[PDB]
């Protein structure tokens, strides 16, 4: 099985934990905010996906960079009912994307929490992020909710596909 | 009254392994157990050392010495039951009572050591105890693990399927384009504080 | 402060025989070695500090590699290595890093192995970095009421040294370890409750002592040993008090216990100066000199009437 490590990062709340969790158990973990990292191995189509799954809050948004090394793809969790740190996210993804070791790195965005009334859709959070203007990079966003599991899947056979043919 | 330090050291005087119960200053363990050997006295009958502020319990064990470090103040008939305490817990993880062996097993003694004193304490714990604290065999962690290799089972299975149906949704997509009673009880007691009373007290 | 001036609980001379092994080495042994490699690793890596060596290094490499791991060995190991390894800067700052660990000690407390929390909550009692307790409160709190005595017994002595040390993070300590000690059957976890009142708050530890007061007799000889710790603290602090315990105290004369028998006559000569009570203690010392065996105990206890002579 090739074994593919990818970075998931995002904003607090974002809601990554509950994906992580819900591709590996099956099951909705209510999750605190990660203050921490969590790592799990997920089987897909005979890709074995080692998921790093880095805490988003502000004191440790400067620990990321110490993820980035043989860093495969990159899973970038959005709240898309939070428009008030949309930008703050836009910025610490551009900053991201900017660092040398994550050049090569195929970026998946889950535009998370589709389920809730007040999200924006993931064409306007394509636009909010900047995600058009980013040159030499593959990337993808893709609507999803963590609590149903929908998009999920997805999501992840565009990553496999994408890490199948880089090769 | 309370335990120190219990250190293992060997007849020359080194001290191999020490663990401290109380907080004390790296030097100050150290200058205890660098004094220890030029303190003990050879040929007498026992087997403690007073200074002016500690006092050394010490069992020799062939080559080595299973030493205690305790207050002049502690009781010393619970420090005795403390150091033959320690003493059996060396053999049960050091076959032979010599310096390599002391120094290979130095984690695990270190580790039934903080199972019979706690903040300069001791707990009540024998042998078969301390080997069933050190072991960790929990019930609970089988249980948990056995119920977490279900689920992570479980979730592999539901994986595979969503995988598989994806791949033939991504194909099918692409397909179509009375008696005297003598003595009462607690007399003895009564009779002293009656006594004591009589004193002025 | 220098390793010399900072607190010791562990001394490990071990002749360093083979090549001290480098940085580098060890660094790959706990990244790519196996379990008893890196159990190997780690406790090379435990020596060299206790010896004074300063491995920065490797910090990051043993939370990455080693922390995650469910090795009952290298989890105890991990232990020791975190009592002895700096936590802050030079300047008094928490690291960074040791946010990481913080949640590992959080996992550990919530277990499903009782040896693993009650390892950790022992090694909690050394933490004097208040910023890595404060959000393990929660998870120590919920250990007393753990269904086996082990976890119980060493959250107590945690709830102590954290009341002790810090205050602030658990004011209602007292109050929590009495309900405690007033429900619990273990008779460690008794002790150890009971022991925390008589430094913590020592009306309430008189109050349940009120309560047992005519069943003392009764006890294991461990937790009558600390309720003889505590008439002795409380009748020095408050010489009113001795007429109340003078009774309890005579009565621990004639305990089974050769440990209870001496330390009740140390404590009834504290209590009372009446030619009776002083020759119930002597009596009793003389006994303890005559039945035990062990010169050790002759001699000491031989010292104690000694002591009294002076007077």
């Known amino acids: 099985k090739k074994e593919m490590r990818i970075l998931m990062v995002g904003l607090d709340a974002a809601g990554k934990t509950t994906i992580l969790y819900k591709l590996k158990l099956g099951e909705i973990v209510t999750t605190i905010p990660t203050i921490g990292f969590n790592v799990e191995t997920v089987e897909y189509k005979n890709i074995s996906f080692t998921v790093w799954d880095v805490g988003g809050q502000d004191k440790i948004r400067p620990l990321w960079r110490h ?5 495969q793809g990159l899973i970038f969790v959005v709240d898309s ?54 040159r030499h990079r593959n990337w993808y966003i893709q609507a999803t909710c963590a609590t149903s599991g929908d998009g999920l899947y997805e999501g992840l056979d565009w990553l496999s596909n994408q890490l199948r043919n880089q090769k | 009254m309370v335990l120190l330090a219990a250190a293992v050291c060997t007849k020359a005087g080194k001290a191999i392994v020490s663990r401290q119960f109380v907080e004390m200053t790296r030097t100050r363990i150290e200058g205890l157990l660098a004094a220890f050997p030029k303190l003990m006295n050879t040929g007498k009958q026992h087997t403690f050392v007073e200074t002016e502020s500690v006092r050394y319990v010490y069992q020799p064990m062939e080559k080595l010495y299973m030493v205690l470090i305790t207050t002049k103040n502690s009781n010393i008939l619970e420090d005795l039951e ?82 598989k149906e994806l791949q033939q949704a991504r194909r099918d997509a692409e397909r179509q384009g009375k008696a005297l009673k003598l003595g009462a009880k607690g007399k003895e007691v009564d009779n002293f504080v009656d006594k004591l009373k009589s004193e002025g007290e | 402060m220098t390793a010399a001036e900072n607190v010791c609980y562990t001394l490990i001379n071990v002749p360093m025989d083979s090549e001290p092994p480098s940085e580098i080495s060890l660094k790959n042994d706990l990244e790519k070695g196996d379990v008893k490699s890196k159990t190997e690793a780690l406790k090379k890596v435990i020596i060299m500090i206790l010896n004074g060596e300063k491995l920065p290094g490797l910090l990051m490499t043993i939370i990455r590699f080693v922390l995650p791991l469910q090795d009952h060995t290298i989890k105890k190991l991990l232990l020791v290595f ?43 009692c050394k933490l004097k970095e208040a910023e890595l307790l404060e959000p393990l409160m929660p998870a120590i709190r919920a250990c007393l009421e753990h269904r086996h005595s082990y976890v119980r017994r060493n959250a107590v002595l945690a709830i102590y040294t954290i009341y002790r040390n810090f205050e602030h993070l658990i004011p209602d300590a007292p109050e929590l370890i009495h309900d405690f000690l007033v429900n619990e059957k273990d008779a460690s976890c008794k002790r150890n409750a009971f022991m925390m009142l008589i430094h913590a708050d020592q009306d309430r530890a008189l109050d349940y002592l009120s309560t047992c007061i005519d069943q003392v007799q009764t006890f294991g000889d461990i937790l009558q040993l600390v309720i003889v710790e505590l008439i002795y603290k409380v009748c020095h602090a408050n010489p009113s008090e001795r007429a109340r315990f003078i009774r309890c105290i005579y009565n621990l004369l004639q305990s089974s216990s050769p440990a209870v028998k001496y330390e009740a006559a140390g404590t009834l000569v504290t209590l009372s100066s009446a030619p009776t009570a002083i020759k119930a203690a002597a009596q009793c010392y003389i006994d303890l000199i005559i039945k035990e065996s062990d010169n050790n105990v002759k001699l000491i206890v031989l010292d104690r009437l000694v002591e009294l002579k002076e007077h």
């Not at chain 3, 700052?93 to 919530?110: N, P, S, T």
């Open chain 1, 67 to 71: 993820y980035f090394q043989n860093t």
């Open chain 3, 82 to 124: 975190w009592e002895i390894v700096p936590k802050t800067t030079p300047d008094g700052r928490l690291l960074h890093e040791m946010i990481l660990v913080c949640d590992a000690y959080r996992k550990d407390l919530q277990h499903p192995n009782e040896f693993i929390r009650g390892s950790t909550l022992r090694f909690l």
């Open chain 2, 82 to 163: 403390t150091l033959r305490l320690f003493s059996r817990v060396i053999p049960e993880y050091c076959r032979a009572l010599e310096e390599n062996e002391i120094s290979e097993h130095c984690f695990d003694l270190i580790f039934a050591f903080d199972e019979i004193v706690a903040l300069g304490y001791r707990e009540n714990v024998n042998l078969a105890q301390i080997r069933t604290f050190t072991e960790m065999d929990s019930h609970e962690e089988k249980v948990f693990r056995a119920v977490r290799e279900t689920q992570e089972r479980e979730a592999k299975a539901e994986m595979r399927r969503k995988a």
């Open chain 1, 81 to 134: 009912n939070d428009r008030e740190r949309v930008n703050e996210a836009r910025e610490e993804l551009m900053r991201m994307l900017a660092e040398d070791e994550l050049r090569d790195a195929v970026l998946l965005v889950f535009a998370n929490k589709q389920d809730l009334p007040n999200a924006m859709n993931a064409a306007e959070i394509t636009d909010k992020l900047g995600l058009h203007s980013l």
